Scaffold this active site. Structure first.
Site, mmCIF file in Angstrom:
data_model
loop_
_atom_site.group_PDB
_atom_site.id
_atom_site.type_symbol
_atom_site.label_atom_id
_atom_site.label_comp_id
_atom_site.label_asym_id
_atom_site.label_seq_id
_atom_site.Cartn_x
_atom_site.Cartn_y
_atom_site.Cartn_z
ATOM 1 N N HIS A 154 0.805 -1.210 0.000
ATOM 2 C CA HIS A 154 0.000 0.000 0.000
ATOM 3 C C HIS A 154 0.846 1.273 0.000
ATOM 4 C CE1 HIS A 154 0.296 -0.687 4.347
ATOM 5 N NE2 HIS A 154 -0.062 0.563 4.549
ATOM 6 N N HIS A 178 1.104 3.865 2.047
ATOM 7 C CA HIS A 178 1.564 4.556 3.248
ATOM 8 C C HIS A 178 3.045 4.795 3.220
ATOM 9 C CE1 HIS A 178 -1.964 4.148 6.314
ATOM 10 N NE2 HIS A 178 -2.032 5.261 5.605
ATOM 11 N N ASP A 238 5.395 4.254 5.164
ATOM 12 C CA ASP A 238 6.268 3.131 5.570
ATOM 13 C C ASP A 238 6.395 1.986 4.565
ATOM 14 O OD1 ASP A 238 3.577 2.427 6.179
ATOM 15 O OD2 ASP A 238 4.189 1.200 7.896
ATOM 16 N N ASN A 240 -2.881 2.099 13.454
ATOM 17 C CA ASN A 240 -3.299 3.352 12.833
ATOM 18 C C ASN A 240 -4.549 3.173 11.956
ATOM 19 O OD1 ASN A 240 -3.387 5.879 11.546
ATOM 20 N ND2 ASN A 240 -1.824 5.260 10.043
#
Ligand SMILES: [Zn+2]
Ligand SMILES: [Zn+2]
Length: 215
Positions: free
Chosen positions: A74, A76, A78, A168
């Site tokens: 994904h 994100h 990170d 999160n």
């Protein structure tokens, strides 16, 4: 078999002959290293360029092959964070269109946006299927399936046993996440190992754990 780097920041444990888990402290994130006859394939790189560079360099040295491809599960920070490193080294950064456009929207360089809902890739001998099961941890999260091993990379869609909550949820779809997890369980009825986004490798039980976390 756990090989750490110089710093202990990066660690790789073998799942089988050709599949390794990579884990970086950023909170430890997991990905895979796929040792294939055509080069190394990462399922996810790392938090940022610095760690992604160290990751690649560690695996390239150890396995005596180049990293040729990465699958980004994904958009994100990170997961997308080492994209600059991948692109400048000519490492193919695979992702869905949605992940790529989220990456672009968030100011990141774009991965390929080549993955569909189900995409089947083959790297040398290594078979890899990417599956977008629907929204969960993020709207774009995909899972990665190694049909030759029945190993599922859950990424952040899947929480480890040690995870006592959803982490999160700012970007999450906590209503659809259960359905997405169901979609994974329906698609992969026989799972040998599941690699969560963070934490210890488990089995189907991690998908059940994630379901419970969603109640
Ligand atoms: Zn995430
Ligand atoms: Zn993650």
């Amino acid at each position: 078999t756990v090989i750490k780097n110089e710093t202990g920041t990066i660690s790789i444990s073998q799942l089988n002959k050709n599949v390794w888990v990579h884990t970086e402290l950023g909170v430890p994130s997991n990905g895979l290293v796929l040792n294939t006859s055509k080069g190394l394939v990462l399922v996810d790189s790392s938090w940022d360029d610095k760690l992604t560079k160290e990751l690649i360099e560690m695996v390239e040295k150890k396995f005596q092959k180049r990293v040729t491809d990465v699958i980004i599960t994904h958009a994100h920070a990170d997961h997308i964070g080492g994209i600059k490193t991948l692109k400048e080294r000519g490492i193919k950064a695979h992702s869905t269109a949605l992940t790529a456009e989220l990456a672009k929207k968030n100011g990141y360089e774009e991965p390929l946006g080549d993955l569909q809902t189900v995409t089947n890739l083959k790297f040398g001998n290594m078979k890899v299927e990417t599956f977008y099961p629907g929204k969960g941890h993020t709207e774009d999260n995909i899972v990665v399936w190694l049909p030759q091993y029945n190993i599922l990379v859950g990424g952040d869609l899947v929480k480890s046993t040690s995870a006592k909550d959803l982490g999160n949820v700012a970007d999450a779809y906590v209503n659809e996440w259960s359905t997405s997890i169901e979609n994974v369980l329906k698609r992969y009825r026989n799972i040998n190992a599941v690699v969560p986004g963070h934490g210890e490798v488990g089995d189907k039980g991690l998908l059940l754990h994630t379901l419970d976390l969603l109640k």
